Amino acid sequence: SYKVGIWGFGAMGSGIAKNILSKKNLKLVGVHDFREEYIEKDVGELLGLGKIGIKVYPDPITMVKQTDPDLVVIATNSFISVVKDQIISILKENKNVITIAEEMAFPFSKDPKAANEIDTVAKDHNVSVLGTGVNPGFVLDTLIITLTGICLNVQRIKAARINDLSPFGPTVMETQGVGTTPEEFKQGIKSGKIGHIGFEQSIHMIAKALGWEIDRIEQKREPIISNVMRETKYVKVQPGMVAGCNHTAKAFYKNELLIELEHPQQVLPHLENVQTGDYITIQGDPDISMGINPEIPGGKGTIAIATNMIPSVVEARPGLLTMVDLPIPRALLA
Amino acid sequence: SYKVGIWGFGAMGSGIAKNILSKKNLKLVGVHDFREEYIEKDVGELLGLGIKVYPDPITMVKQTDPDLVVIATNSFISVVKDQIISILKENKNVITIAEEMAFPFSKDPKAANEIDTVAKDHNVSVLGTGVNPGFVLDTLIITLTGICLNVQRIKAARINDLSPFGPTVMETQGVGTTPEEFKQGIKSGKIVGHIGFEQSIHMIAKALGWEIDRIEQKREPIISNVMRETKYVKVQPGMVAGCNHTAKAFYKNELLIELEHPQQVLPHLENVQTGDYITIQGDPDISMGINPEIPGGKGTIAIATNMIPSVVEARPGLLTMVDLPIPRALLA
Numbered sequence A: 001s002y003k004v005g006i007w008g009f010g011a012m013g014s015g016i017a018k019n020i021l022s023k024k025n026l027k028l029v030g031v032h033d034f035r036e037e038y039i040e041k042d043v044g045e046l047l048g049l050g051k052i053g054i055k056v057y058p059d060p061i062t063m064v065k066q067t068d069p070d071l072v073v074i075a076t077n078s079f080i081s082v083v084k085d086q087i088i089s090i091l092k093e094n095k096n097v098i099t100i101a102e103e104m105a106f107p108f109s110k111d112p113k114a115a116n117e118i119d120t121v122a123k124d125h126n127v128s129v130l131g132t133g134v135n136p137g138f139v140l141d142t143l144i145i146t147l148t149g150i151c152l153n154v155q156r157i158k159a160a161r162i163n164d165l166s167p168f169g170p171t172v173m174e175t176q177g178v179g180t181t182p183e184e185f186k187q188g189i190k191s192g193k194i195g196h197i198g199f200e201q202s203i204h205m206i207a208k209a210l211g212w213e214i215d216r217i218e219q220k221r222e223p224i225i226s227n228v229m230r231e232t233k234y235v236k237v238q239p240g241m242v243a244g245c246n247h248t249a250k251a252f253y254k255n256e257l258l259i260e261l262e263h264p265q266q267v268l269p270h271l272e273n274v275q276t277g278d279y280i281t282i283q284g285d286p287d288i289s290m291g292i293n294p295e296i297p298g299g300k301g302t303i304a305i306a307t308n309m310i311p312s313v314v315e316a317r318p319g320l321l322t323m324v325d326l327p328i329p330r331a332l333l334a
Numbered sequence B: 001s002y003k004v005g006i007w008g009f010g011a012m013g014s015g016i017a018k019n020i021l022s023k024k025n026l027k028l029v030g031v032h033d034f035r036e037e038y039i040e041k042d043v044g045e046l047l048g049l050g051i052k053v054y055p056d057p058i059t060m061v062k063q064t065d066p067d068l069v070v071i072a073t074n075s076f077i078s079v080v081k082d083q084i085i086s087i088l089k090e091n092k093n094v095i096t097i098a099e100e101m102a103f104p105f106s107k108d109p110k111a112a113n114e115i116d117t118v119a120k121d122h123n124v125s126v127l128g129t130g131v132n133p134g135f136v137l138d139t140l141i142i143t144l145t146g147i148c149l150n151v152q153r154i155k156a157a158r159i160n161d162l163s164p165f166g167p168t169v170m171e172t173q174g175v176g177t178t179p180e181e182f183k184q185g186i187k188s189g190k191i192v193g194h195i196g197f198e199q200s201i202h203m204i205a206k207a208l209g210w211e212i213d214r215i216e217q218k219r220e221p222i223i224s225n226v227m228r229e230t231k232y233v234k235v236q237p238g239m240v241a242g243c244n245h246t247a248k249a250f251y252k253n254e255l256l257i258e259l260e261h262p263q264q265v266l267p268h269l270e271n272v273q274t275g276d277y278i279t280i281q282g283d284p285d286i287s288m289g290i291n292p293e294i295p296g297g298k299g300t301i302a303i304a305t306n307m308i309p310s311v312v313e314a315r316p317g318l319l320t321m322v323d324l325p326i327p328r329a330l331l332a
């Protein structure tokens, strides 16, 4: 077995904890969160499993010292500027790290000095760090890249992830601009209340893996404007109002389009015959056209991949790794 | 640049050679085949493009000094074991497309232990790969389970075109036989259909930590109504164009893995649609289709080529696809 600690016990951290508890060769050993409502409570009671004898620690360093995990999963924040010190904190204790921070999936191009720092500390303490997740971490990077494994040569990549926002509450409705008018949408993008984090990371992982240079990435966030009435538990989109945000990205080299990613997120796509799914098109020799229907669920997949990568991160060479350096993902035995 | 040798210059070996020649980070250095028609000829002339075909594999490796030899000879461990071991004793790495070499640890543990031991003694590595087994019904399925919390059952289908492969495969699938001859050949063991189901099953099972105690197989002939002529074979009407091979793996009467692999030469002559389909029943459920199918020739050539650097770079021993980093296309 491998011993695991958790640093953020939110939607993802808690799902991950529960998933760890299901695995035959993993052991959940401690959890830390900075929310007053969780500190000192039993993790099993917080997950609805009754008491398991694992308390939420007030301090991450105390958690690692007292329980001795081989690896800590950090599910706190998206940004390198915030998570760098969290990761480095754990590496200084000679433990491995998986994070789902979207920027940590491939940080070498966005923030080279921070990536170099993490990699150096990781090496000094003989341990490894990986950033992963469903997106970035699997569907628009790892899966595409693996698919090119049976190509003789690749000219262009086009991929899309279409999801349904219906299940989520107001917090997500506001982040995707759902229920807004077009003017309110445009003000929301300027203000930062309204898309997707990770396109730059996915692009650069694909490029690194294929040996391509990328010199330009263009991004666009456009309102998906409903022609029909869409009503969930938490929102009512009238015709002409916004049902979600369409975040697209295009990566170029010298005016050649190489990679093209799209991820429209809307409430109730099926009301206009938009099919949820993941779709990958490799143009090359040969051409490949893959569809997964419906889409790999974002919460479940992230919980799954962060858990499933644990043994290979513990076992890997020291340093800042990426999904492209590690063996193929697999479901761990329950 | 990684220097490569080839042992087996058939449909796949030759395509692999040509693919190696296209790559920035590889270099083709020698080729050996046992066909009189090839020996001493230039490999570039044979492909329609200063590398001679050697009569002896050991002489080829000694005289040209590859880091790795690709073996595209035969399907069976009982035949290729000595070919692989022959190259490892020269301190070189090996990739083979032998279907049995994709995952030999459960079918033939003592042969796998022998290859692994010799590989370790000489500080080099061996991998078995290919489109199938090696990617579509093992590596790809397994990767997909990477986003599952738990997996109950796997069902997958590969509708395939046999056109790209040479006489060795044509004979193993009973192509160009009469239907009665095909059915007698499956019973007698002269025709076996698709080789690799057992290997794919055990790779999936090992990766997920499942035990398999029973594998049932069924092989039926696909009878052509039309004339089908490929580079290597001619199927007259009423003759067999391929084999419909299915396999089911169980644990205690619970079906865990189900594979369908209908294979024929030139399916499109009778409007047979190809493709690769995967259904994972679990939490969550996953349902993937690739349409048309990953071409069998191109994908095999591709994957055997693309895995070269990672096999050279790997830890010593008998590896499998599940031990190595993710497959990717090498730059041309």
Ligand SMILES: NC(=O)c1ccc[n+]([C@@H]2O[C@H](COP(=O)([O-])OP(=O)(O)OC[C@H]3O[C@@H](n4cnc5c(N)ncnc54)[C@H](O)[C@@H]3O)[C@@H](O)[C@H]2O)c1
Pocket: A007, A008, A009, A010, A011, A012, A013, A014, A032, A033, A034, A035, A075, A076, A077, A078, A079, A100, A101, A102, A132, A133, A134, A135, A136, A137, A298, A302
């Ligand atoms: N890689 C991916 O594809 C992917 C997918 C899902 C989520 N994510 C990212 O992961 C995080 C989401 O996790 P979530 O959905 O559970 O979020 P969340 O907001 O529900 O959970 C965050 C939890 O961590 C706690 N936390 C935050 N900062 C902390 C700190 N410094 N110390 C201790 N606890 C701290 C919060 O209080 C909360 O309990 C976000 O950064 C999200 O962007 C990425």
Ligand SMILES: NC(=O)c1ccc[n+]([C@@H]2O[C@H](COP(=O)([O-])OP(=O)(O)OC[C@H]3O[C@@H](n4cnc5c(N)ncnc54)[C@H](O)[C@@H]3O)[C@@H](O)[C@H]2O)c1
Pocket: B007, B008, B009, B010, B011, B012, B013, B032, B033, B034, B035, B072, B073, B074, B075, B076, B097, B098, B099, B129, B130, B131, B132, B133, B134, B164, B165, B166, B167, B168, B169, B296, B300
């Ligand atoms: N794993 C996969 O997905 C996959 C796919 C395609 C083929 N294969 C296997 O790879 C092998 C090659 O198939 P192919 O279509 O290229 O066949 P082929 O008949 O076209 O070529 C085989 C070649 O090997 C040569 N050869 C055979 N035995 C030899 C020996 N002992 N020493 C030297 N040369 C020898 C033959 O003369 C010929 O050139 C077969 O066994 C086939 O089943 C695997």
